[PDB]
């Protein structure tokens, strides 16, 4: 296997193939984040669908500036 | 057990600790802790939304005329019932997942802080008990004042002096 300067520079970034943390761990954070993302997506979808109306938001072509 | 904070020391004029099995004492401690936690949460949940309504942040017609925190009962009954049902289901999970004598201990042990020293742990237990004791009286005071006067807490304070702004 040929060795190059860039290879030696980037070698540490690829050296831990297979390393894991034993048994669950940060999974509940992942679940909570996924739930919050789902809520956010539902909010924006219902705003765009006009099924959720809030003050000072008008879903129509805007004069802009 | 761990109470009797130096301010007044041990307090039991009724002497309920004399005729009580140790299991009864543990149950009393658990009941006190649960009532304290719920009281703290309720006090915060009365303090914050009333201020939000006072500032007008949540639009107009948030908590009806006389915008107290009790107007949610008669402006949103279905939603209140759903909240109570969710709480009941979660506490049913707590009941079926926990044995007697450990009902106040959530087996978190890896997500919080939990200071290492045992003396600091006892001090933290005392602090939790004390803030819960204060909140238990605060909740009842808020309920009684709101039911008697039919006005918000801060509105009453501004009405009857006390505060300057």
């Amino acid at each position: 296997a040929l060795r190059t300067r860039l290879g030696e520079i980037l070698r540490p970034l690829n050296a831990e193939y297979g390393k894991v943390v034993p048994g669950w761990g940060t999974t509940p954070i992942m679940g909570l984040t996924m739930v919050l993302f789902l809520v956010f997506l539902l909010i924006i979808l219902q705003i765009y669908n006009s099924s959720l109306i809030i003050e000072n938001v008008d879903v129509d072509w805007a004069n802009a500036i | 057990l761990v109470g009797a904070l130096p301010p007044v020391g041990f307090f039991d004029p009724a002497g309920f600790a004399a005729k009580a099995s140790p299991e009864e004492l543990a149950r009393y401690r658990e009941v006190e802790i649960m009532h304290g936690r719920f009281a703290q949460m309720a006090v915060l949940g009365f303090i914050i939304p009333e201020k939000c309504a006072y500032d007008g942040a949540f639009g107009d017609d948030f908590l009806a005329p006389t915008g107290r925190a009790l107007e949610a009962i008669n402006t949103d009954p279905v939603w209140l019932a759903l909240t109570l049902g969710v709480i009941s289901a979660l506490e049913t999970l707590r009941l079926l997942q926990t044995e007697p004598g450990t009902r106040t201990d959530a087996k978190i042990e890896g997500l919080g802080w939990r200071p290492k020293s045992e003396a600091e742990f006892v001090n933290y237990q005392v602090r939790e008990l004390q803030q819960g004791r204060l909140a238990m009286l605060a909740f009842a005071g808020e309920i009684a004042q709101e039911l008697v006067n039919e006005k918000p807490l801060l509105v009453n304070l501004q009405d009857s002096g006390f505060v300057s702004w």
């Binding site: - | 290492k116 600091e120 001090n123 505060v163 300057s164 702004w165």
Partner: protein, 163 residues
């Protein structure tokens, strides 16, 4: 640790957040000297806030006379030119780090009787001065940003017999 000057009585060892757990003796010295310097600064600053409302000096700090200057508190910084503030800051810092002035052998006094108690009293007074400086700064900023945010007047409130 838990064996060092600072414990008074009502609270004893006050380390609720466990700041002094995984440290050696050299870091606690830095903590203590920072606490002492902040406290001494607050002790000076409470009087420096109280006193300029009864009398002023006879200077002129350049074109704008120091007496009857901007309104005492946070508004007074803008009136003084930045170059003079830099001069004073650097003079202070030279005196602090280099030890020029201040450290006088006539200073270190008596020290014959109680020593472990006077330092504790000084620390307690400094902590109280720290808290007093917070509120004082809070009141100044709140009233300066918006006039009448809180229904109070007389900057140094609580002492109406002065101003």
């Amino acid at each position: 640790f838990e064996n060092e000057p600072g414990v008074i009585a009502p609270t004893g060892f006050f380390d609720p957040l466990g700041f002094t757990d995984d440290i050696d003796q050299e870091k606690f010295d830095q903590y203590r000297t920072a606490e002492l310097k902040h406290g001494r600064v607050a002790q000076l600053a409470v009087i420096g806030y109280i006193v300029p409302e009864i009398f002023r000096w006879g200077f002129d700090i350049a074109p704008g006379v120091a007496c009857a200057d901007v309104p005492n508190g946070v508004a007074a910084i803008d009136a003084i030119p930045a170059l003079g503030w830099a001069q004073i800051i650097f003079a202070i810092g030279a005196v602090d780090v280099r030890g020029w002035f201040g450290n006088f052998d006539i200073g270190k006094p008596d020290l014959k009787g109680k020593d472990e108690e006077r330092a504790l009293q000084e620390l307690q007074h400094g902590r109280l001065a720290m808290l007093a400086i917070l509120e004082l700064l809070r009141h100044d900023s709140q009233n300066l940003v918006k006039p009448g945010f809180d229904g109070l007047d007389n900057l140094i409130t609580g002492l109406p017999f002065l101003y």
